[PDB]
Design an enzyme around this catalytic site. Structure first.
Site, mmCIF file in Angstrom:
data_model
loop_
_atom_site.group_PDB
_atom_site.id
_atom_site.type_symbol
_atom_site.label_atom_id
_atom_site.label_comp_id
_atom_site.label_asym_id
_atom_site.label_seq_id
_atom_site.Cartn_x
_atom_site.Cartn_y
_atom_site.Cartn_z
ATOM 1 C CD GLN C 10 -2.869 1.249 2.303
ATOM 2 O OE1 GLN C 10 -2.973 0.319 3.098
ATOM 3 N NE2 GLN C 10 -3.739 2.252 2.256
ATOM 4 C CB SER C 130 6.385 1.113 4.381
ATOM 5 O OG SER C 130 5.283 0.238 4.338
ATOM 6 N N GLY C 134 2.950 -5.651 7.286
ATOM 7 C CA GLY C 134 3.359 -6.963 6.816
ATOM 8 C C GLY C 134 3.516 -7.095 5.316
ATOM 9 C CB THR C 135 1.561 -5.826 2.432
ATOM 10 O OG1 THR C 135 1.843 -4.425 2.521
ATOM 11 C CG2 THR C 135 0.271 -6.061 3.186
ATOM 12 C CB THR C 169 -0.666 4.935 13.464
ATOM 13 O OG1 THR C 169 -2.076 4.725 13.602
ATOM 14 C CG2 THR C 169 -0.192 4.271 12.192
ATOM 15 C CG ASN C 196 5.342 9.245 8.570
ATOM 16 O OD1 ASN C 196 4.940 10.285 8.057
ATOM 17 N ND2 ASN C 196 4.685 8.100 8.478
ATOM 18 C CG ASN C 218 2.653 10.221 -1.388
ATOM 19 O OD1 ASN C 218 3.377 9.343 -0.928
ATOM 20 N ND2 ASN C 218 1.334 10.201 -1.262
ATOM 21 C CD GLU C 244 32.501 9.099 -11.966
ATOM 22 O OE1 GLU C 244 32.035 9.038 -13.123
ATOM 23 O OE2 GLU C 244 33.340 9.957 -11.617
HETATM 24 N N1 LIG Z 1 3.763 8.220 2.705
HETATM 25 C C1 LIG Z 1 2.748 7.409 2.969
HETATM 26 N N2 LIG Z 1 2.721 6.735 4.167
HETATM 27 C C2 LIG Z 1 1.690 5.908 4.442
HETATM 28 C C3 LIG Z 1 0.664 5.734 3.535
HETATM 29 N N3 LIG Z 1 -0.224 4.871 4.059
HETATM 30 C C4 LIG Z 1 0.212 4.492 5.273
HETATM 31 N N4 LIG Z 1 1.388 5.131 5.521
HETATM 32 C C5 LIG Z 1 2.185 4.974 6.731
HETATM 33 O O1 LIG Z 1 2.858 3.746 6.572
HETATM 34 C C6 LIG Z 1 2.661 2.885 7.672
HETATM 35 C C7 LIG Z 1 2.380 1.456 7.204
HETATM 36 O O2 LIG Z 1 2.805 1.261 5.872
HETATM 37 P P1 LIG Z 1 2.433 -0.069 5.032
HETATM 38 O O3 LIG Z 1 3.573 -1.058 4.976
HETATM 39 O O4 LIG Z 1 2.050 0.342 3.631
HETATM 40 O O5 LIG Z 1 1.182 -0.740 5.781
HETATM 41 P P2 LIG Z 1 -0.199 -0.925 4.990
HETATM 42 O O6 LIG Z 1 -0.519 0.317 4.204
HETATM 43 O O7 LIG Z 1 -1.296 -1.185 5.985
HETATM 44 O O8 LIG Z 1 0.014 -2.230 4.062
HETATM 45 P P3 LIG Z 1 -0.119 -3.698 4.716
HETATM 46 O O9 LIG Z 1 0.846 -3.793 5.871
HETATM 47 O O10 LIG Z 1 0.160 -4.794 3.710
HETATM 48 O O11 LIG Z 1 -1.526 -3.883 5.224
HETATM 49 C C8 LIG Z 1 1.500 3.452 8.466
HETATM 50 O O12 LIG Z 1 1.848 3.513 9.827
HETATM 51 C C9 LIG Z 1 1.263 4.848 7.925
HETATM 52 O O13 LIG Z 1 1.579 5.832 8.883
HETATM 53 C C10 LIG Z 1 0.672 6.400 2.329
HETATM 54 O O14 LIG Z 1 -0.260 6.204 1.528
HETATM 55 N N5 LIG Z 1 1.731 7.244 2.048
HETATM 56 MG MG LIG Z 2 -2.014 -2.342 4.157
#
Ligand SMILES: Nc1nc2c(ncn2[C@@H]2O[C@H](COP(=O)(O)OP(=O)(O)OP(=O)(O)O)[C@@H](O)[C@H]2O)c(=O)[nH]1
Ligand SMILES: [Mg+2]
Ligand SMILES: Nc1nc2c(ncn2[C@@H]2O[C@H](COP(=O)(O)OP(=O)(O)OP(=O)(O)O)[C@@H](O)[C@H]2O)c(=O)[nH]1
Ligand SMILES: Nc1nc2c(ncn2[C@@H]2O[C@H](COP(=O)(O)OP(=O)(O)O)[C@@H](O)[C@H]2O)c(=O)[nH]1
Ligand SMILES: Nc1nc2c(ncn2[C@@H]2O[C@H](COP(=O)(O)OP(=O)(O)O)[C@@H](O)[C@H]2O)c(=O)[nH]1
Ligand SMILES: [Mg+2]
EC number: 3.6.5.-
Lengths: 425, 426, 426, 425
Positions: C10, C130, C134-135, C169, C196, C218, C244
């Site tokens: 995500q 990220s 988990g994903t 969070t 963040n 973003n 390089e």
């Molecule tokens: N820059 C940015 N940060 C995000 C976004 N969505 C979530 N985050 C931050 O990224 C953290 C988790 O990132 P992810 O690995 O993508 O978790 P997820 O979106 O729930 O994906 P899954 O773990 O697979 O369910 C959260 O604590 C958010 O604060 C986004 O769309 N853009």
């Molecule tokens: Mg997710």
């Protein structure tokens, strides 16, 4: 160089109707036998399939054979039904009831004389013929048995001409009839020796291609017959149009068949793209090449990766260049050095034509002679063994004059064929 | 291609009445025989605006046929097609076969022959009867014997009503239902058996009708027959001829007792909420709660089955649903039958009759299965007969009519042999 | 010179969205793929007047993918380039490594071999995800190991998101953020780390804005990727290649965590007063308040660095301008390094998109330099999880999927080895 | 992602009756199954609780249970009564007296089959579903006795998927049925392991919440149910609509339940304001959050200030600023550090959806499992403690014959549950 067309049974009639539709579309012939074309080459070899009549009309070299009248009425009333000559419609009144025994001995023996007289007339009309195309299935009783008798007699009368069969072999996952394996084995027993080359096609893999690659949610029989018709039109393009490098039926026959019994082929066509995903696709030979050679696209329910490609042939249509073809062929041979035979170097036959399919720029057809065909047959034989041991449904056939010894020969001959393909793999 | 239907007895005449009103509804033919094609399979056209069926009505009592003669459908049949006697069989197999049989058996046969002179493609005969009464057991057995001798290899189908084990209305039923087994066993190409109480349950639960009388049950049976013959009478994506179906279903010469069921049967109000799709209806065809004879397939193993779809059906989902059903361990099949399905799809939807108990649908399925469960439907009954034969009750009535006391011995032996065969193949 | 981008999870969808919209504006290609040299690097040309991305979207989550199907920029992506799942990992590392990892990994891996086939001088892949959920942890962690196996010597990059120490969070974040560390050291030539909170101060203070939302985070991440690759797509007085750049940045094989920050970030009005001088920006660049890394460079001793100009820059001020800090003692050079800078100038003026929060500036600078101060960013986290694992709460959730209890140690030993590695280097 | 619904007992049906009235208005579906919505986002995930049927209509995936025929007559005639399929009705004809003895032993075996077939029917309809929802009241026997066996069987057959129970426990202040200690005692021994997450409601709270926060003068079962149904609707918005951050049922427990045993959940809803005081509030996120975690509105008879919060979840609705929440959350995080368990930092779970409740700019729900769970049961435990020991009314329950060892087995599990709850506090 002429080719007369023979169709048998409901399946064969539907396939043949779709074929004649597409090819009349290809040559500019209207639905009433008239001609309204533009390109001159359409007339250069129009007579390979058609015969001329008074008033500037064409009628195809077709024969429709069936043991019931409903399907014949359906094809007569359907589109492009008035193209055919009425004398060519040959149909009986009783039917077979999915009996191979009834189709061979009791019912088809009375009706075979008329069709042999008509095909004799068609061969009389021709200038110098080469081949017969036969369309049928190996599941039902009418088509399989009647066509097998027809092939035997035709071969007996013509020992020098080339013979073609475009079969459909049943698959367990699309199984439809409780007595399929008897039909399949009893037909193949002498289809092994009565024909020159045979193309194998399955409804299972056709559903796979239609659902997934075509992204079809509703594959009806029209679409499957459409796919097979495109293959059948693509095989013999070198005859009806010129080319930089040519290949007719006899060249393929000598090039793909290393030994007399090894003439069971698996076809494939490229491209096959949906109406919406075509805007996002390139236009080049290499993509066509891997898409043909892709193990995910073949029209037989068997994986080629379980064996090694014996020989292949590629037919390209469109304005293209030969260096590209040979470079791609050597690329595939080098990359897939595991999946090609070693004691035959440069296993690819090549041909290039000029006129592309209407509305498209390039197209490609692949014919492969491989070692995986055994697995397409053994799966059948097991289903046979579960039947003949307890004599299920056997009395229906035995009442027609057959015996268990003929089943013994059928199993033995299937064993010989599968052993032959295993030996060279 | 034509078929001739022979109705015998009160039950046969009633079921035939339902069926022929159904056919007239289907083909747009008013009761007076005039039509404001495909009808030649059952109908003959005479000159101008006149169609008459290939049917014959038979009884040894005048009442049930005079009700037809005075009824609304008087103008549709020939007068000569309606044959009546003077004394009924009095619920005696012996009187039906021997004393009162030969007084009429010739005449109808002659008439049958006349009908066979009209046809050019005779497919087969449809016989409606029951094992309860004396007329439709003995005289029908005699009729099938004569027909089998005279015609030979022509296919003959019957549509019987087996006597219910608990819900029965006569005292001497087992004698009739046991002595009829010879001529059905040795002279029938296909046999359908149906129970009245099972249809009663189907009416109570699925249709939610408070009070089923005989009209509704006869209507269900007529629907089944129409769906079986819609392959001949129309044209569609796939075709199943009669002899095709006999070839695919019957595995052995002595085993020709398929069990029938139909789907969907739904009440008028409850139809709106359900949206009937192919997967659920092919599931419903296998429910023991919709099997038309009070037997449990769970105690048996399926041997083969035939499915006949009509309406808007395409082969893709048929294959998907059949593959789905093949994965259940509750629905069991014999080992030497890797594939056990014959499939047919037609195009014309079934038509609803006014005043009927069924709602309009776009699709329908008829299922015909050959199983080994139905053996039990005899095993219970074989008790009822023998228990009553211990004291030789009622036997004097049959002995006085020319029957001998050993006949029941061969009846019991033939049923024992047939049960043994169903045991051994299963 | 061409590259292939992979957006997974995500978190990878936003940045996948922001990057590819940003690239469309830079090359002036309207979303339909029409152009009103060097433009081949991210797009593949199809015949005439059709360009598409060399991009793939990967996810187990259907809600956040189908949006790119419906927004304005659906037309860019191929249908086959776009992959969805059916269950998300529930914020668990090894589900992407064990349970649902192999169910799609070979599916998309077939695409990578299609997309690897078009290339001739392929340079590398960009992976966005990220370290939080988990994903983005496990299922992304699965991909690289297979990707490293097949190719090897070609360069491979990542864009990650760390979890903040104070403001976060999700409950279990270090669990996911501990297990990835085994792969990143052993399976990336360069690992770009972004957090963040650093976005928050950068936006609050420098951007002079009220509420930087998920667009604004973003747009920083979008603008970073644009800066790294503009050396591939264009030319200037001095050119920077990744071959390089890798040699000149990483001094020992285990030192691959660059520190990034972007300048200048500013609102529209505030560009009116300031003269963005080349000597002005270079001094303003290294200062700790703009750092995207929650660390103090005053606590680290520098060795080497990459500075990137872009626009109209003359190198004649550069010799003095870095020497301007070379004569400053607050930022330090190691004893064995006479000079520790890599230079980058691009002759293509930066392009500002509509809806952005920058003022169009002739000159912009992004920093890429590695310090020893980054050690504390893991050391706090290393303490964070060490408190968490003692009690074995929640652990049964992950035990139910199989992984062995010693997995934490090796990376932690390598983490401590990496931490000890930074000490010996530092 | 798909989920089916079960309702049990009387009280479940009326809790079910509003859940199906409210969920229709969210989706715009009329009382006749038609769709009148504007957002294309409604249909993106409509299949979650509704099944597509021909005629352009939608129907509930609702199964209704009972044991006395008075209750369905009310739910049939009310608004949105025809929504339920007449097949979906399951009910008995005898009556129980809200006895757990008749709720499990005598009558539970008979009607489990009919529902077990109906629930099996809904299993194949969906592609890949995740959960059920069960609603009843734990005060009686039929509400509890049906609930207990239905729970255990489903888990035994279906152990990989999530299971929901939305229960009502009785309280000492607002007690109504004489043997209320019995009904809590025997049921709870099952929920200790046989359901993955259980949401508690105390019936005392429905009165405190309505008179003070809502300033409602006449609490109707329309009003008491209006609160419980609003809690149900908020849990599953992430399934139906997108947002900046998404949170489904899988995502909670793996991140919100600390040990296998600590699964007794507690809601609280916001905003809750009267119609005369709505003109005197602002529009911000911290206004709800400060009011959210507050100890006055949480929907059970327990004050969390007696312990420390273990894990919590707060679900917000509407276009928000995620940066407001996180910078806001740390403020409560730092200020009230007394309730932050030191060895687990960052105790917060967050969820934001984009589509807001209609007629409101934003609204929110709070689900938190804490160390406050213990005080919920010890009062309840003391309730039955004085009852079994003096052997009154034992024989009517003894008319069916379960033994007194399971009382302690539950009681020890409650002690072990309370021992687990005190030690990890
Ligand atoms: N820059 C940015 N940060 C995000 C976004 N969505 C979530 N985050 C931050 O990224 C953290 C988790 O990132 P992810 O690995 O993508 O978790 P997820 O979106 O729930 O994906 P899954 O773990 O697979 O369910 C959260 O604590 C958010 O604060 C986004 O769309 N853009
Ligand atoms: Mg997710
Ligand atoms: N479906 C149906 N079954 C009937 C009807 N009438 C009678 N039956 C069945 O027929 C059986 C009665 O024996 P029948 O064969 O009808 O006797 P019959 O037709 O009067 O012939 P006779 O014995 O000669 O009088 C009973 O077991 C009933 O189940 C009917 O109207 N419809
Ligand atoms: N491609 C295609 N295959 C068909 C069609 N109709 C039937 N078949 C296949 O043909 C087999 C049966 O052949 P059949 O029709 O009984 O031959 P017949 O007895 O001569 O009519 C089945 O396995 C079907 O899968 C059709 O329209 N198109
Ligand atoms: N929250 C709520 N509780 C209710 C409602 N109606 C009844 N109850 C509770 O249900 C309890 C009795 O339920 P009961 O009659 O045993 O339902 P049964 O188990 O189906 O027989 C009472 O103590 C009430 O507190 C309602 O509309 N809302
Ligand atoms: Mg009578």
């Amino acid at each position: 160089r002429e080719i007369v067309h023979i169709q048998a049974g409901q399946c064969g009639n539907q396939i043949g109707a779709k074929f004649w539709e597409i090819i009349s579309d290809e040559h500019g012939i209207d639905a009433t036998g008239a001609y309204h074309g533009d390109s001159d080459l359409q007339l250069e070899r129009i007579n390979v399939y058609y015969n001329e009549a008074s008033g500037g009309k064409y009628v195809p070299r077709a024969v429709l054979v069936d043991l019931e009248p409903g399907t014949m009425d359906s094809v007569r009333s359907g589109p492009f039904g008035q193209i055919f000559r009425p004398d060519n419609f040959v149909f009986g009144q009783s039917g077979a009831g999915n009996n191979w025994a009834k189709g061979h001995y009791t019912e088809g023996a009375e009706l075979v004389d008329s069709v042999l007289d008509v095909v004799r007339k068609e061969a009389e009309s021709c200038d110098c013929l080469q081949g017969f195309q036969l369309t049928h299935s190996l599941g039902g009783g009418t088509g399989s048995g009647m066509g097998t008798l027809l092939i035997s007699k035709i071969r007996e009368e013509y020992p020098d001409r080339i013979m073609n069969t475009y079969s459909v072999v049943p698959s367990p996952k699309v199984s439809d009839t409780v007595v399929e394996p008897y039909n399949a084995t009893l037909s193949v027993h002498q289809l092994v020796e009565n024909t020159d080359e045979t193309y194998c096609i399955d409804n299972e893999a056709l559903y796979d291609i239609c659902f997934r690659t075509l992204k079809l949610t509703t594959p009806t029989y029209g679409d499957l017959n459409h796919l097979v018709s495109l293959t059948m039109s693509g095989v013999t393009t070198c005859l009806r149009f010129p080319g930089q490098l040519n290949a007719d039926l006899r060249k393929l026959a000598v090039n793909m068949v290393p030994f007399p019994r090894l003439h069971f082929f698996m076809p494939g066509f490229a491209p096959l793209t949906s109406r919406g995903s075509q805007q996002y696709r390139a236009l080049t030979v290499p993509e066509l090449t891997q898409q043909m050679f892709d193990a995910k696209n073949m029209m037989a329910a068997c994986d080629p990766r379980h064996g090694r490609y014996l020989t292949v042939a590629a037919i390209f249509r469109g304005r293209m260049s030969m260096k590209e073809v040979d470079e791609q062929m050597l690329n595939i041979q080098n990359k897939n050095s595991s999946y090609f035979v070693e004691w035959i170097p440069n296993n690819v036959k090549t041909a290039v034509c000029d006129i592309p399919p209407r509305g498209l720029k390039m197209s490609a057809t692949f014919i492969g002679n491989s070692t995986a065909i055994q697995e397409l047959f053994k799966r059948i034989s097991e289903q046979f063994t579960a039947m003949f041991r307890r004599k299920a449904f056997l009395h229906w056939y035995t009442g027609e004059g057959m015996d268990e010894m003929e089943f013994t020969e059928a199993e033995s001959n299937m064993n010989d064929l599968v052993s032959e393909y295993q030996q060279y793999q | 291609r034509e078929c001739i239907s022979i109705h015998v007895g009160q039950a046969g005449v009633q079921i035939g009445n339902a069926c022929w009103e159904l056919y007239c509804l289907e083909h747009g033919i008013q009761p007076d025989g005039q039509m404001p094609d495909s009808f030649n399979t059952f109908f003959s056209e005479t000159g101008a605006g006149k169609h008459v069926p290939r049917a014959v009505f038979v009884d040894l009592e005048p009442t049930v046929v005079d009700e037809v003669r005075t009824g609304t459908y008087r103008q549709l049949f020939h007068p000569e097609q309606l044959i009546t006697g003077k004394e009924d069989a009095a619920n005696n197999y012996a009187r039906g076969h021997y004393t009162i049989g030969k007084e009429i058996v010739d005449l109808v046969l002659d008439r049958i022959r006349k009908l066979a002179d009209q046809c050019t493609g005779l497919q087969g005969f449809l016989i409606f009867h029951s094992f309860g009464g004396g007329t439709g057991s003995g005289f029908t057995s005699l009729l099938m014997e004569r027909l089998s001798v005279d015609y030979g290899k022509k296919s003959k189908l019957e549509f019987a009503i087996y006597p219910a084990p608990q819900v029965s209305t006569a005292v001497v039923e087992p004698y009739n239902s046991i002595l009829t087994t010879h001529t059905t066993l040795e002279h029938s190409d296909c046999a359908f058996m149906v129970d009245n109480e099972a249809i009663y349950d189907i009416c109570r639960r699925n249709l939610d009708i408070e009070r089923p009388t005989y009209t509704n049950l006869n209507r269900l049976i007529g629907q089944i027959v129409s769906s079986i013959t819609a392959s001949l009478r129309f044209d569609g994506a796939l075709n199943v001829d009669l002899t095709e179906f006999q070839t695919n279903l019957v595995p052995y010469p002595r085993i020709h007792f398929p069990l029938v069921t139909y789907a969907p049967v739904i009440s008028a109000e409850k139809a709106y909420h359900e949206q009937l799709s192919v997967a659920e209806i092919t599931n419903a065809c296998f429910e023991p709660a919709n099997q038309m004879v009070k037997c449990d397939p769970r105690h048996g193993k399926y041997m083969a089955c035939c499915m006949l779809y009509r309406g808007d059906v395409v082969p893709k989902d048929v294959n998907a649903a059949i593959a789905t059903i093949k994965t259940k361990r509750t629905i069991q099949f014999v080992d030497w039958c890797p594939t056990g399905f014959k499939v047919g799809i037609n195009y014309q939807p079934p038509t609803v009759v006014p005043g009927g108990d069924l709602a309009k649908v776009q699709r329908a399925v008829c299922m015909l299965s050959n199983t080994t469960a139905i053996a039990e439907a005899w095993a219970r009954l074989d008790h009822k007969f023998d228990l009553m034969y211990a004291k030789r009750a009622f036997v004097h009535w049959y002995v006085g009519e020319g029957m001998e006391e050993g006949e029941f011995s061969e009846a019991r032996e033939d049923l024992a042999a047939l049960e043994k065969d169903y045991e051994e193949v299963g």
